[PDB]
């Protein structure tokens, strides 16, 4: 679940760093560009993200693990809002994404549904 | 088999949130209400007491059909027994779809036929009492623990046929100490109470869930304070202006169920603010002996409070305190139990001598590392920590319990009441329970 | 200094530093793009500027 | 700092009321030291956790 932290925020992009070799082999399927990530924002709310670029990097005695997110929303209490406005702040974790949280996204009403994959 | 004393409690607490209801309703110009006055305790030092009063009424009937207000009259006859000094207004409340509002005829001959009453509940409970019986073998029949059904006829027969008199002078509580008007059933009138309230700027959803139930709980504070000249109330828009600064200004303590699930939602949705930021400091004012089972999960919520609100090494930059109301013992007991479960406290306290700088030091922590010296402070409730609570503000501070919170100065602290039962209503306010 | 100070002044733009993570935090609900800030000029004249940017990282 | 990195250990002939005495008047003088005594339970973690140190602010756990 727990995957990084954020190193750099900006409202274009958010910088976030894999903690270790272990995690980042453990979940290496789920760290591919165009699927989500959740950054937590303060104790209850979270950032709701689509990886972008990924830069893992051992020049010499340096391992460096850079993902680049962005925010595509907030999940504020049990509820999705949709902006690029909150700008998590730093050392903050990253938590992957639960399917209850993509299930809540996709909800709508219960009879304007369309099934389509 | 509950005790009929918290029924009795129930429905007096039914009759003072409609009577509170109805006072709201009428508060145009100088009132002066007196609301309720009596809880069932020892002390009546001050009277300010209406009555406790009942409201009972069954599905629709035209007329009462038997024993309706039997029970009511007969409680408030057997309180009348013991009633002296200030005079003591009592009334009785009831809806009725189709019959006359106001006062009923009730001079002297309804009261007999109603004292003419042969129920062996009413008569185990107060005919006995409020009419004494003149035969021995009665008397020691009620007194006794268990009873038959044969000692049970016994009885019914000698209180049919046996006149028995009182020493209560009944006439006198007819003339002064009852009054019966048929109202209206204020389940029907909220919509009419949020319309009403619906006059001010306000809101749709906020008279309903913060102003209606804080002007329920003001208005019904009036009575309780020690001073009786406090209830002094003229140019009642004016005070009605002012409980809307009021309402605004507290947002807390709703008594009943309204919009409030479980045992205790109540906060909640206003508390989340402030408990979505990293860096505060919140301190906890606890009263052991008001929540359940505190010796045994005081440490598994401590725990559950720093997992979520003390975790990050950067951002949650500052310390909880937990203030308990014990003595200066007892804090040692808390700290093994808190050191067998691998949490880092401080107390301040080394056996019975408080250090001032051991309580205002700054845990130094180091990043690279997920290390900070301790973790919270708890403290008993003593003047020296209370003046380092002092020297050093927090920004919310929260009351759980009735302790006094002099002392503590509120220059930029916003204090929170909150009122539980356990833990899992402590934790279900603090966004950290999901459920009950 | 309510919310931070200046660093850097051109014509086109002006830096502003921020003090404090409890600074940011409190006030990051005014803290973005398209707000409007106050820069004092001298001891009684004010700045009226709108926020174009916004940069949060570890030094 | 850098170089001492060891800590030292006084054991008494007394009772655990006179080493809490002994805390007192260390704390007193601003001296950290350790008991491992929570009242008077002892705990083995306690007494034997190794102290840290942040050689930039020249400080030792006790």
Redesign the interface.
């Known amino acids: 679940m727990k995957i990084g932290s954020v190193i750099e925020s900006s409202p274009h992009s958010i910088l976030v760093k894999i903690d270790t070799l272990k995690i980042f082999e453990k979940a290496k399927s789920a760290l591919q560009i165009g699927k989500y990530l959740k950054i937590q924002e303060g104790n209850h709310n979270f950032v709701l993200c689509v990886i972008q670029n990924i830069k893992i990097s051992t020049d010499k005695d340096e391992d460096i693990f850079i993902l680049t997110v962005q925010p595509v929303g907030i999940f504020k209490g049990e509820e999705f809002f949709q902006g690029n406005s909150m700008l998590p702040s730093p050392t903050e974790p990253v938590f992957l994404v639960e399917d209850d949280i993509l299930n809540k996204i996709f909800s709508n009403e219960k009879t304007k549904i369309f099934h389509l994959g | 088999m509950m005790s009929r004393e918290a029924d009795h409690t129930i429905k007096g607490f039914l009759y003072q949130f409609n009577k509170t209801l109805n006072s709201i309703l009428s508060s145009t110009d100088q009132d002066e209400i007196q609301i309720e006055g009596i809880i069932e305790d020892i002390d009546i030092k001050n009277s300010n007491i209406t009555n406790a009063i009942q409201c009972k009424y069954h599905e629709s009937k035209v007329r009462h059909n038997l024993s309706d207000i039997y029970k009511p009259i007969l409680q408030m006859l057997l309180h009348f027994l013991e009633n002296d000094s200030l005079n003591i207004k009592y009334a009785l409340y009831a809806y009725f779809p189709n019959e006359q509002v106001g006062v009923k005829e009730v001079t002297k001959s309804q009261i007999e036929e109603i004292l003419s009453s042969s129920n062996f509940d009413y008569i185990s409970k107060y005919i006995s009492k409020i009419k004494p019986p003149k035969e021995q073998i009665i008397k020691e029949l009620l007194g006794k623990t268990s009873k038959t059904t044969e000692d049970k006829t016994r009885i019914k027969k000698y209180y049919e046929t046996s006149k028995l008199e009182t020493i209560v002078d009944i006439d006198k509580f007819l003339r002064d100490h009852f009054v019966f008007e048929i109202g209206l059933s204020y389940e029907e009138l909220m919509n009419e109470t949020k319309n009403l309230l619906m006059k001010e700027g306000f809101s749709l959803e906020d008279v309903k869930d913060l102003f209606y139930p804080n002007s329920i709980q003001y208005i019904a504070e009036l009575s309780i304070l020690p001073e009786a000249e406090k209830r002094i109330s003229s140019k009642n828009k004016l005070i009605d202006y002012l409980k809307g600064n009021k309402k605004t200004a507290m947002s807390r303590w709703t008594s009943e169920v309204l919009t409030r699930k479980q045992l205790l939602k109540v906060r909640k949705n206003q508390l989340?603010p402030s408990?979505?930021?990293?860096?505060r400091s919140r301190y906890f004012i606890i009263d052991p002996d008001t929540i359940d089972n505190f010796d045994d999960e005081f440490i598994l919520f401590v725990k559950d409070y720093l997992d979520?609100?003390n975790s990050?090494?950067?951002?949650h930059?500052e310390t909880p305190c937990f203030i308990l109301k014990t003595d200066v013992n007892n804090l040692?007991?808390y700290?093994?139990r808190f050191?067998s479960r691998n949490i880092q406290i401080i107390t301040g306290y080394?056996?019975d001598?408080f250090?001032f700088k051991?309580f205002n030091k700054e845990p130094?922590r180091?990043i690279k590392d997920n290390?900070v010296?301790f973790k919270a402070r708890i403290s008993c409730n003593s003047d020296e920590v209370i003046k380092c609570i002092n020297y050093k503000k927090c920004d919310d501070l929260y009351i759980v319990g009735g302790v006094d919170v002099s002392l503590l100065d509120t220059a930029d602290v916003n204090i929170e009441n909150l009122e539980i039962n356990n833990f899992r209503e402590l934790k279900y306010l603090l966004?950290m329970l999901k459920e009950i």
Do not use: A, F
Not at chain 2, 312 to 315: D, R, V
């Open positions: 989340v408990l979505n930021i990293n860096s979520k609100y990050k090494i950067k951002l930059t040692s007991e700290h093994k050191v080394i056996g001598t250090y051991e130094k180091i290390w010296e966004s």
